[PDB]
Amino acid sequence: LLDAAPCEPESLEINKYFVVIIYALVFLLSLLGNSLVMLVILYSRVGRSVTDVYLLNLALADLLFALTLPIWAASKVNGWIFGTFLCKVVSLLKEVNFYSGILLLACISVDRYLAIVHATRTLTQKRYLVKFICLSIWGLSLLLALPVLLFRRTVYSSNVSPACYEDMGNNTANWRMLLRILPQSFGFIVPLLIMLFCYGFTLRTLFKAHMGQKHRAMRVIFAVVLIFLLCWLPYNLVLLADTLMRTQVIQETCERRNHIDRALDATEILGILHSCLNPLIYAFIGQKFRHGLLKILA
Amino acid sequence: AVLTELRCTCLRVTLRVNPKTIGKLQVFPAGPQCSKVEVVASLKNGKQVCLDPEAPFLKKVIQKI
């Protein structure tokens, strides 16, 4: 008798306040780290190695993402009251930065694989295309993020407060499912495959080495891979669960809706730390950048 | 309220209802929020139900709107 009835989208103020605080703290930390990395790299042009270019681009991407964060914090505070143009611009910038960061992690992994595995051979001469590779990655991210620019507008509803959602048509609900295949395919699967292959073979070659400092290199490689997974796995898992729920593959209940809806925000908050942990994981863990920072202090 | 993934307002439909017991009626047309048209009837006892937009009587009532 009581099976059929409306489901109320539920929320709590504590979550809003917590999200605001976390977003602000992450903004500050990412800004500081990225600014320091850029200052260290650009100050002196001595030894502008490929890794320096890659770290520069990665820091720029993270800095832009952090710059866009605060508007997202306000949106979470009260929904998108900031207008349609800001929705389009902010969404474009956010998606472009996210794609570029992921694909730049992939490219850094490719560089390391071609540097430590194929080190004795002449293939190592093919890693001097950092300019072209970086430009291509930025262009591909830009092209892949245009669906956000074209098909995002403020959406109004009687029970739901404004939010910068998609407007693709009256059957947009299904269309968003197809759109989601992009971030979950060239955003987690391809990058994870490339990183796994590259770092696995790098680990093999290092494990077959008699060097004096194999230990720290292995630790840092494992740290990078585990940090990437810990950062991005939950968001993709929850996204796949949500898509399956909308496909009616998994039985759908109001409480399941609420659970997945809260989990989405929690996982986004956790994942956003990719802009904050990158400077330590990739750059400051090496003696070169610490030495450069100390030298600049004069 | 607050939401990042907008979803349909009804999961299942009711075909057993009396017009007199209905207190308020609202119509949600298809749009960016949900694919299927929704008709919500809030009864006089505080209970709310979702009705079939394709039902002949309800379809005519909605069209008249």
Q: What angle do CA A89, A243, A17 make, to 5 degrees?
A: 55
Q: Is A223 exposed, middle or buried (0-12, 13-18, 19+ CB in 10 A)?
A: middle
**Measured between alpha carbons, how far is B65 from B52 in angstroms, rounded to an integer?**
16
Q: B42 - beta bridge partners?
A: B24, B48
**Measured between alpha carbons, how far is A229 from A246 in angstroms, rounded to an integer?**
25
Mutate to test the interface with B, among A8, A14, A17, A160 (most CBs of B within 10 A): A160
Is B50 an interface residue toward A (CB < 8 Å)? yes
Q: First CA to last CA across chain B, in angstroms?
A: 27
**Measured between alpha carbons, how far is A175 from B31 in angstroms, rounded to an integer?**
12
**Measured between alpha carbons, how far is A98 from A104 in angstroms, rounded to an integer?**
10
Kindly compute the dihedral angle of the four CA atoms of residues A287, A123, A111, A98, in this order, to the nearest 10 degrees.
160
A3, A8, A79, A4: which is closest to A258 by C-alpha?
A8
CB-based contacts of A133-138 (< 8 A; 24+ apart in sequence): A133/A107, A134/A53, A134/A54, A134/A57, A134/A104, A134/A107, A137/A57, A137/A100, A137/A103, A137/A104, A137/A107, A138/A57, A138/A96, A138/A100
Q: Cα A21 from chain centroid?
A: 20
**Measured between alpha carbons, how far is A72 from A148 in angstroms, rounded to an integer?**
15
- The sheet with strand B22-28 has its strands ordered as B22-28, B38-43, B48-51
Contact A105, A51 (CB under 8 A): no
Residues B32, A265: C-beta atoms closer than 8 Å: no
Residues on chain A touching B49 (C-beta within 8 angstroms):
4-5
**Measured between alpha carbons, how far is A275 from A265 in angstroms, rounded to an integer?**
17
Cβ-based neighbour number of residue A10 at 10 Å: 12
Cβ-based neighbour number of residue B56 at 10 Å: 8
Residues 6+ apart with CB under 8 A from A80: A86, A87, A154, A162, A163, A164
Residues B50, A5: C-beta atoms closer than 8 Å: yes
**Measured between alpha carbons, how far is A279 from A54 in angstroms, rounded to an integer?**
12
Contact A203, A211 (CB under 8 A): no
Nearest CA to CA, how far is B8 from chain A (Å)? 9
- Give resolution in angstroms: 3.7
- Strands B48-51, B38-43: pairing is antiparallel
Superfamily per CATH, domain A13-296: Rhodopsin 7-helix transmembrane proteins (1.20.1070.10)
**Any idea which fold B19-64 has?**
OB fold (Dihydrolipoamide Acetyltransferase, E2P) (2.40.50)
The angle, 0 to 180 degrees and rounded to 10, between the axes of the packed helices A214-246 and A189-207 is 160
Place of tokens 């009396």: B18
The DSSP 8-state label assigned to residue A126 in this structure reads: G
Contact A231, A277 (CB under 8 A): yes
Question: A154 phi and psi, to 5 degrees?
Answer: -60, 135
3-state class (DSSP) for residue A166: strand
Question: In angstroms, how far apart are the furthest CA atoms of chain A?
Answer: 77
**Measured between alpha carbons, how far is B13 from A170 in angstroms, rounded to an integer?**
20
Residues on chain A touching B13 (C-beta within 8 angstroms):
4
Q: What angle do CA A50, A128, A185 make, to 5 degrees?
A: 80
Nearest to B1 among A160, A167, A264 (CB): A160
Nearest CA to CA, how far is A167 from chain B (Å)? 5
A255, A159, A175: which is closest to B35 by C-alpha?
A175
Q: What angle do CA A25, A31, A33 make, to 5 degrees?
A: 100
Q: Where are the alpha helices (DSSP H) in chain A?
A: 13-43, 50-78, 84-116, 130-144, 146-150, 172-180, 189-207, 214-246, 254-271, 274-278, 287-296
**Measured between alpha carbons, how far is A186 from A100 in angstroms, rounded to an integer?**
11
> Domain ranges in chain B?
19-64
